[PDB]
Design brief:
The PDB classes it as electron transport(heme protein). The structure is a homodimer. By secondary structure, chain A is mainly alpha-helical. Chain A is 41% helix and 0% strand. Bound molecules: heme C (HEC) (2 copies).
């Protein structure tokens, strides 16, 4: 792609420290500040049911792939301006790889 | 995305007339001139097992999404130069939509 696989273990601790505060990755896990992410890849932005998204996320109609996900994670707000996800971004490529490796695997 | 849904019925006849000659979309369908495509989306180019791909397809490490698929279908050779898929391309956006709608659905 324009993405390479990292440590899913490493990625798993990146999440707790960075995503957990607003997210769940488990099938049957609840939405929180952020929506649960089970089954995110191959699915389009704004479709989890029971979640209240911004007009922003919906309209982007992002199709979430490992690659798409990397750019978003760099600067969500730049990528989807008007998004209410308050995360600054994963400046570091190695960080993101790890993370998407993590997601890739547990959102399944 | 940068892709919109079309007629899966229409798409199904585009395939027979344009893809069929070298492909199968069914789980348990055989590779032919081209590889069977069951489960193509979310999977990377060159991974069907038992298929002999060019050095080209492999190296691109394309992650196949509805979107990726559109660009490829326009001009495979431009997109993955050195690819041995002998198809000229689907110049027409509406044609491709239909097709990916079709694939989207039956490669599942
Ligand atoms: C709260 C402080 C958050 C943190 C930390 C992270 N995210 Fe988030 N995320 C949050 C919100 C409020 C939303 C909804 C956006 C909207 O505008 O409605 C999101 C959304 C996402 C998405 C898109 C959801 C979809 O389209 O289904 C993804 C892929 C996502 N969040 C992932 C994610 C990761 C991996 C995080 C840690 C790096 C992360 N977010 C942090 C809120 C919060
Ligand atoms: C024979 C004349 C073909 C026709 C008509 C179409 N395709 Fe094809 N396809 C063909 C070959 C020989 C290959 C392998 C490429 C290589 O370099 O090894 C392919 C490959 C594809 C792929 C990529 C396969 C993968 O990475 O798993 C896709 C997505 C694909 N073909 C789709 C496709 C469609 C939808 C077609 C009709 C428009 C089509 N191809 C025509 C051979 C032939």
């Amino acid at each position: 792609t324009e993405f390479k696989a990292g440590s899913a273990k490493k990625g798993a601790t990146l999440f707790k420290t960075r995503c957990l505060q607003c997210h769940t990755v488990e099938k049957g896990g609840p939405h929180k500040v952020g929506p649960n992410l089970h089954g995110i890849f191959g699915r389009h932005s704004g479709q989890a049911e029971g979640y209240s998204y911004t007009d922003a996320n919906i309209k982007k109609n992002v199709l979430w792939d490992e690659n798409n996900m990397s750019e978003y994670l760099t600067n969500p707000k730049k990528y989807i301006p008007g998004t209410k996800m308050a995360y600054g971004g994963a400046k570091k490529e190695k960080d993101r790889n790890d993370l998407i490796t993590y997601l890739k695997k547990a959102t399944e």
